[PDB]
Amino acid sequence: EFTQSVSRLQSIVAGLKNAPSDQLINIFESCVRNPVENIMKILKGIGETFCQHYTQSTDEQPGSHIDFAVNRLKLAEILYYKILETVMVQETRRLHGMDMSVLLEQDIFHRSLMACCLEIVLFAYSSPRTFPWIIEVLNLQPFYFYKVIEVVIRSEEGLSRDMVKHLNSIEEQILESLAWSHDSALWEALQVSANKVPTCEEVIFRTGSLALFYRKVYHLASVRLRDLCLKLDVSNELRRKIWTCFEFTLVHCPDLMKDRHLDQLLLCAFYIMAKVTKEERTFQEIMKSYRNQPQANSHVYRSVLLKSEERGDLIKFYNTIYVGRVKSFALKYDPPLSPFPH
């Protein structure tokens, strides 16, 4: 009588409270800095904002009743304390008897976890409020939030294959756009790296947040290129060159990505690199082939950012901005290559 989604949730949070269990509480008291009130505060704050925004009718998302909000918050909290408790019990610092004051006082983890959870309720009630409404409403930087998604699938296995598929698809929304927003912290972190973009040998074959974002970004791109290379039936010897043009743009043109899509730069590298060898496929042969992937809409290649404002079309981008920023490297191939992961 419930849906297979809302049904799993209520089995997930059976006879759990929306409060820490006596085993999460004891890991908290095992800390010099017991983190219970700062965690209890965040949860109050995220909630009061959740409810202030849920219940306000913007002319873009109509506003619903308070009665359901507190229902969608109580649940996201029960899951928080359950996934907090899993996460902390499995932490190899807990397992080697070490003092977890420093893990338990990273608020961006606490805030994105509660966020990730809130998305789970709303996805699983089929909510109007499509991602990324939740991170917007809560002022969360998608660059810092995406890192909780790989923690929550492995710290809650009672999650349907349609919950996970959801969590990986919003993780992919953050690696393809969203985190390359002008206001993202990816730019602050590339700055304190003297603007040094990590390459596919230093991340697939250095550590941190920049390396792990470009590790997941090089992974998503490589996957999307394999499945275009197959559908458009070109060499494994040229694909290994379209990847080195798609690395040149990320690495020696990383502004190109600002307020844009991963796919705009990947598709543009295909056409340019099929043409400077004698193995031509065309932007339509490519539009249609690409048109088939789960992340592929028309806006990506029919509404491309050109000026920062003039927007337009993927071909106008190749002619106005791309040809001029890449032709130098691309025409060296008529010159070392980069390694395709997997």
């Binding site: 056409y271 340019i272 043409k275 400077v276 065309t282 932007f283 339509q284 539009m287 290649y301 029919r302 079309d313 993927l314 071909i315 190749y318 002619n319 040809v323 032709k327 691309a330 025409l331």
Partner: peptide
């Protein structure tokens, strides 16, 4: 000239 003289339509 590595330019696309194509004209996206539909």
């Amino acid at each position: 000239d590595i330019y696309c003289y194509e004209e996206f339509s539909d």
